[PDB]
Design a protein around this ligand. Structure first.
Ligand SMILES: O=C(N[C@@H](CSCc1ccccn1)C(=O)O)c1ncccc1O
Ligand SMILES: O=C(N[C@@H](CSCc1ccccn1)C(=O)O)c1ncccc1O
Ligand code: NI
Ligand code: NI
Ligand SMILES: [Zn+2]
Ligand SMILES: [Zn+2]
Lengths: 384, 384
């Protein structure tokens, strides 16, 4: 009833079209845009969903010669005698109103996320379920996007589980550490020679210009005492950060920091990058956090007068993350696989207790948000 | 001599360290920075070049308690009785002056690059020489970065060559088209029921938020008349535009256009993204171009009043690219490999002579600029 056309006209100048639907809603469409998106086989390929029409063959000052219509189609003719047909629902979807434009975007990028601090309820799902049923994989990825972390439980106690979640999404993000990477730790109890420390909050691989979108951490076998994992919602924190200290937020969202990483793994390497600890989009919203104090280079490209104030804003930031109001604590169990957003969440670890025995085997991997995102859309279509 | 300290003092407040080299230049260093990048094993992890000192342990209001020095080192004690040693040449490198910073930056990211036009002289190198000699590999990458393109010659006539180059840089960039894709065209000698148009200028894969940085194109077999390759230097162009049409430039470098791509190759997919055709850094410098009219979505999230102006401004951009002074034409031959910057150059193809035998076979691959940059950093240190 809203996708049905009541009145369609080319207005004045013939450079714009007005569609009035049976729900008393009006839409405006630029002729030049209509010409550029003619559904005709000569201009578009339905299969590849690509446009054949060349820009060179596009009169930016084009105007509608004439048009007729019915309830679900608009017929347009142009000066060069070119013919086009547009579907009512196709137009409606692409309405230039602020609301229609906003709605379509929501439908394309799943921008809704749920903020959280220490009151977070860690989402859970079954590893094998996510593999066999799409209803679940959809629940897995859509939750990962909204919340930023999902705990898949019930995986084997051997390597190769993250690889399976890889095929499920599409493919992992190959880095200098390889396709996957195994972490292994073993310290006998009562050993006075060793000393364990905590792990300050961070995001992985900030030494790359395009950091890994999501991380996959499978816990094969783990026997520890106080190695509780900790995590904070970078977005939530940033919001609170500017609200409680604009000066800090300013500096961190505008000062470029250099990150490096040299070594040999999948090959010899030497990476460097410049990132702003708090990256914002052109509209001022936090889109990614880039921070790993261990990889922040000793080189700092900025005038001396900026240095001290910078370290101050960083301090305030790290303190805000450590406040119990921001950090969620939990513990991984053998067979579990953690999956989170590395642009959003910052993770760390508590301090292993005393001289207690510690032994763990973990397998990790990264995935790109474009791959996950693509998978999410295909999956949302299979489930709905 | 420039790395030789004549005098080093902790200016009043002890929040800054002033050093005067035997060459008469004075370098300033903030106390908090020195204390943050302490070389001591307890704070820094030399072998890994990673910081092990936590931010929580860094007093942003710290000052130097006392210090002594010789011609090649500075020794500093801190209030909390911590001890530090600094290398003079190490400090000389990280000087906060404008020049030093800009200098060290150049060493890290190879910013240099020559703009070009129709008067371009295509850099060439031998395929096998690049594979065996690091000097030729350095010449290959440095030029690629600097000029935007490099033509390797001598590759075999069988697939699997662009793979050897990948293993030479580090590793290829896997996309939805596998690790490598192939193109095989074979239109018979004088076919009447078929026509071959031209390819407009474009960059590849704008549908990804992180488009492929470098493209590798191997010409395995090509038997064609006409259809010459056409490349253009986007950076040069973008600059000429800003000069001739500040409005067009302003629009293109500030409007977010949608790009889409759905299909199946390495697996099914439905990638969607938003990009400013002319991407600028935070200093107004063009750092990347994102354009492929085919994969530019029919969806356009922008207020109607901006539509026509945008279309008008793109036509400007495209017309400038097709200008006789902006494009460089060349024809690739069998056995050679074209390697170019997919973020800078835009490529197209001329129209094949009508009714002429068309027989092609090429193998392509993508690479990430960070992987290439790493190889480039590791090679410079091996040839220089
Ligand atoms: O955070 C890192 N590793 C830590 C944590 S990985 C396990 C983990 C993952 C997510 C949340 C809490 N703990 C470790 O090995 O214990 C890490 N990140 C980047 C590079 C090297 C690392 O050890
Ligand atoms: O530009 C594309 N292909 C064209 C050109 S690839 C050969 C080429 C590469 C670089 C410069 C000129 N020609 C073709 O197959 O003839 C292309 N790009 C992205 C997706 C599909 C394509 O066919
Ligand atoms: Ni980590
Ligand atoms: Ni192409
Ligand atoms: Zn048409
Ligand atoms: Zn120290």
């Amino acid at each position: 009833m809203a996708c049905t056309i009541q009145k369609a006209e080319a207005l004045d100048g013939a450079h714009l079209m007005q569609i009035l639907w049976y729900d008393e809603e009006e839409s405006l469409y630029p002729a030049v845009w209509l010409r550029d998106n003619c559904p005709c086989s000569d201009c578009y390929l339905d299969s590849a969903k690509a446009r054949k029409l060349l820009v060179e063959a596009l009169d930016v000052n084009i105007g509608i010669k004439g048009l007729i219509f019915d309830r679900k189609k608009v017929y347009i003719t142009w000066p060069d005698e070119h013919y086009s047909e547009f579907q009512a629902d196709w137009l409606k979807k692409r309405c230039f109103s602020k609301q229609a434009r906003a709605k379509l975007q929501r439908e394309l990028f799943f921008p809704e996320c749920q903020y959280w601090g220490s009151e977070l309820q860690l989402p859970t799902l079954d590893f094998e379920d996510v593999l066999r049923y799409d209803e679940h994989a959809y629940k897995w990825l859509s939750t990962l996007k909204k919340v930023g972390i999902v705990r898949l439980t019930g995986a084997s106690d051997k390597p190769g589980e993250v690889s399976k979640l890889g095929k499920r999404m599409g493919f992992l993000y190959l880095t200098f550490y390889g396709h996957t990477w195994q972490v292994q730790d073993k310290i006998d109890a009562n050993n006075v020679a060793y000393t364990t420390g905590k792990l300050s909050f961070h995001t992985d691989y900030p030494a790359l210009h395009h950091p890994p979108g999501v991380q996959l951490l499978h816990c094969i076998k783990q026997t520890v005492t106080g190695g509780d994992s900790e995590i904070v919602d970078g977005f939530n924190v940033c919001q609170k950060l500017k609200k409680n200290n604009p000066q800090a937020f300013q500096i961190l969202s505008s000062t470029f920091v250099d990150f490096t990483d040299i070594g040999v793994d999948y090959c010899d390497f030497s990476v460097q990058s410049k990132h702003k600890i708090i990256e914002l989009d052109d509209k001022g919203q936090v889109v990614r956090i880039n921070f790993n104090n261990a990889t922040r280079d000793t080189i700092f490209d900025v005038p001396v007068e900026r240095v001290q104030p910078f370290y101050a804003a960083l301090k305030e930031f790290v303190d805000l993350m450590n406040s119990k109001e921001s950090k969620f604590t939990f513990k991984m169990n053998p067979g579990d696989v953690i999956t989170f957003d590395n642009w959003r969440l910052l993770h760390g670890r508590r301090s292993y207790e005393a001289g207690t025995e510690i032994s763990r085997h973990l397998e990790g991997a990264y995935a790109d948000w474009d791959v996950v995102m693509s998978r999410l859309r295909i999956l949302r279509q299979r489930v709905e």
